[PDB]
């Protein structure tokens, strides 16, 4: 087919691989930041459930 086919295919491959490398580095940074200070979706460690707390009036008023 000629040299331009291989040339532009190589350009497309290089663009894909460079984008993948940048995405992997960004993913590493995102994971590190979330694990250090969990405020995104990931690394959300559990917490006791709020809905299982009694709020009805009880025997002792000092609650």
């Amino acid at each position: 087919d000629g040299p331009e086919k291989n040339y532009e295919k190589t350009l497309a491959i290089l663009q894909i691989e460079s984008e993948k490398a940048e995405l992997r580095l960004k993913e590493q940074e995102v994971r590190r930041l979330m694990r250090a200070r969990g405020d995104g979706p990931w690394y959300q460690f559990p917490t006791p459930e709020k809905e299982f707390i009694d709020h009805s009036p009880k025997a002792t008023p000092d609650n």
Partner: protein
Amino acid sequence: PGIVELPTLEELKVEEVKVSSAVLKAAAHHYGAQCDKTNKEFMLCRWEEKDPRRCLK
């Protein structure tokens, strides 16, 4: 932290009922029928404001 604010003995002074438990239980039902409104107000303030110092009156 901050110090705790609690009232003095003059604020806690009242004419206590020097009445035994058998006497109270004998007069229990009529005391619960006649003095009901003040008692229910005190229980409402105690169960709303958990602090006992807000209900001395």
